[PDB]
Amino acid sequence: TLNGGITDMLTELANFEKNVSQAIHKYNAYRKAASVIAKYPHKIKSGAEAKKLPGVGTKIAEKIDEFLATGKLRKLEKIRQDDTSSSINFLTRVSGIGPSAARKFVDEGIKTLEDLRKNEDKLNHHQRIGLKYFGDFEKRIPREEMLQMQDIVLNEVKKVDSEYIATVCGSFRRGAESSGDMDVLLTHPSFTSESTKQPKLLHQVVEQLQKVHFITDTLSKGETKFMGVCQLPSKNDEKEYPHRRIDIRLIPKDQYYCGVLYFTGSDIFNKNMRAHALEKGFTINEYTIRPLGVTGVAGEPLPVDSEKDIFDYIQWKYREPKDRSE
DNA sequence: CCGACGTCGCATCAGC
DNA sequence: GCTGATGCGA
DNA sequence: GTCGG
Ligand SMILES: Nc1ccn([C@H]2C[C@H](O)[C@@H](COP(=O)(O)OP(=O)(O)[C@H](F)P(=O)(O)O)O2)c(=O)n1
Ligand SMILES: Nc1ccn([C@H]2C[C@H](O)[C@@H](COP(=O)(O)O)O2)c(=O)n1
Ligand SMILES: [Cl-]
Ligand SMILES: [Mg+2]
Ligand SMILES: [Mg+2]
Ligand code: NA
Ligand code: NA
Ligand code: NA
Numbered sequence: 001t002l003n004g005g006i007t008d009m010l011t012e013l014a015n016f017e018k019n020v021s022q023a024i025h026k027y028n029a030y031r032k033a034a035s036v037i038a039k040y041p042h043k044i045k046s047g048a049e050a051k052k053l054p055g056v057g058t059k060i061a062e063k064i065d066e067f068l069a070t071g072k073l074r075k076l077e078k079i080r081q082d083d084t085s086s087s088i089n090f091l092t093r094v095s096g097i098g099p100s101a102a103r104k105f106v107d108e109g110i111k112t113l114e115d116l117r118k119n120e121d122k123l124n125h126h127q128r129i130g131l132k133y134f135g136d137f138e139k140r141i142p143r144e145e146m147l148q149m150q151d152i153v154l155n156e157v158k159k160v161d162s163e164y165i166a167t168v169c170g171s172f173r174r175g176a177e178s179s180g181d182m183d184v185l186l187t188h189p190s191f192t193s194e195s196t197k198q199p200k201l202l203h204q205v206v207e208q209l210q211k212v213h214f215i216t217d218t219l220s221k222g223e224t225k226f227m228g229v230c231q232l233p234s235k236n237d238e239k240e241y242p243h244r245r246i247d248i249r250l251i252p253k254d255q256y257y258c259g260v261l262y263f264t265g266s267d268i269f270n271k272n273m274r275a276h277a278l279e280k281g282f283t284i285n286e287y288t289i290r291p292l293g294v295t296g297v298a299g300e301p302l303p304v305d306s307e308k309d310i311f312d313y314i315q316w317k318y319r320e321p322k323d324r325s326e
Numbered sequence: 327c328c329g330a331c332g333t334c335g336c337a338t339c340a341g342c
Numbered sequence: 343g344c345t346g347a348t349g350c351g352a
Numbered sequence: 353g354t355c356g357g
Contacts, residue, residue, distance in 0.1 A: 017353090025330085025331060026354095032354080033353080054354085055353090055354065055355085056353095056354085057353060058354090059353060059354085095350090095351085099349085100350090101350085124337080124338080220335080220337065220351080224336095225335045225336065225352075227351070249335085262334095270332070270333085272332095274333070275331070277332090278330095283332085284333085285332080285333050286352095
C-alpha cells in the first residue's frame with residue numbers, strides 16, 4: 001500500500017482512543033481518516049496534501065508532517081511507554097474484554113495473559129472463550145478455507161430445511177483473499193417483517209452445525225444473532241485448523257437487500273453510507289431505508305428490491321461489494 | 327463556534 | 343420479573 | 353478529531 005506508514009499510525013491512534021481514552025468519536029474519526037488515506041492513489045508528500053481529503057483535518061495533517069519528517073510520532077512513542085495504556089490495549093485484544101473491563105482488570109492486578117489464565121473465574125462466558133482462543137482469533141482465514149467453511153454451512157443448512165438461504169458476507173463477499181472471521185446472513189420464508197410463522201429458526205441451524213462439530217463454542221445467542229466459534233475438520237495425522245469466529249444473522253426474508261448491504265460492509269463503508277443517507281434525508285439500518293421528516297422522526301419504509309435501490313435513494317452510484325472495503 | 331457523528335443484537339446490572 | 347441504561351459486539 | 357450549518 002502507498003501510505004501504509006500513515007494509515008498504521010492513524011489506526012494505532014484510533015485504537016488508543018477507543019481502548020484507553022474511551023473516546024468513541026475520536027476512534028471513528030481516526031479510522032475514517034485512515035480509510036480515506038488508504039484509498040488515495042498517491043504516495044502522500046505532506047500533511048497539507050492529506051488535509052484535502054474528507055476526514056483529515058488540521059491535527060492529523062500535523063501528525064502526518066511529523067511522521068513524514070521523522071518516521072515516527074512522539075505522541076505514539078509515549079503511549080507505547082505508558083504501562084497502563086500498554087496493559088489496557090493488550091487486555092482488550094481478548095474477545096469480550098472491552099475498554100471498561102480492561103481498566104477494571106488492571107485495577108485488580110490482572111494485566112497479562114498469565115494473569116488471565118490464573119483468574120478464569122473472574123471472566124464471564126464470552127471472555128473465557130475469548131481467552132481460550134486468544135491466539136487463534138488473531139490469525140486470518142485464507143479464502144480457500146473460507147470456501148470450505150461456506151460449503152459446510154450451506155450444505156448443513158440445506159439439510160435442516162431446503163428453504164433456508166445462507167449467504168456468506170463480510171470481507172468474503174467483498175472478494176477478500178483472506179478474512180478475519182466468517183459472517184453468515186440467514187433467511188427463511190417463515191420469518192418476514194410481517195410474521196414469524198416458525199420458532200427456533202436460528203437455533204435449529206446452530207444445533208445442526210454443533211451436531212457435525214463445526215460450531216464448537218457459543219459467545220452469545222438470541223433469536224436473530226449468533227456469535228460463536230467454529231472449526232474446519234482436519235484429516236488423519238493433520239494438525240488441526242485454528243478455531244475461527246463465526247457470526248450468523250437471521251434477517252427477515254423480505255428485508256434481505258438491506259440485510260446483505262449491512263452485513264457486507266465494511267464497517268467504515270456502512271458508517272459513511274449511513275451518514276450520507278442522513279444528509280440526504282434518509283436513515284438506513286439492516287432492515288429498511290426510511291425517509292426522515294422535518295421533525296427528524298423516521299417515516300415508513302421505502303420499497304427496496306435490490307441493493308442498488310438503496311444506493312439510488314441516496315443519490316450514490318452503485319458500488320459492487322469489492323469496492324466497499326473501506 | 328458547536329452539535330452531531332450509524333444503527334442495532336445480546337449480556338449484564340441497577341432500580342423498582 | 344420488567345425496563346432502561348451500559349458494555350461489547352456485528 | 354472533523355465536518356457543516
Ligand atoms: N461496527 C460494525 C461492525 C460490522 N458491521 C457490519 C459490517 C461488516 O462488514 C459486517 C461483519 O463484521 P466484521 O467485523 O466481521 O467485518 P468484516 O467486513 O467481515 C472484516 F473485513 P473481517 O474479514 O476481518 O471480518 O458487519 C457494521 O456494520 N458495523
Ligand atoms: N440469503 C438470501 C439470499 C438471497 N435471497 C433472495 C433475494 C432475491 O430474491 C434473490 C437473489 O438471489 P442472489 O442474490 O443469490 O442472486 O434471493 C434470500 O431471500 N436470502
Ligand atoms: Cl426498521
Ligand atoms: Mg467478518
Ligand atoms: Mg456531520
Ligand atoms: Na479534509
Ligand atoms: Na476485546
Ligand atoms: Na464477524
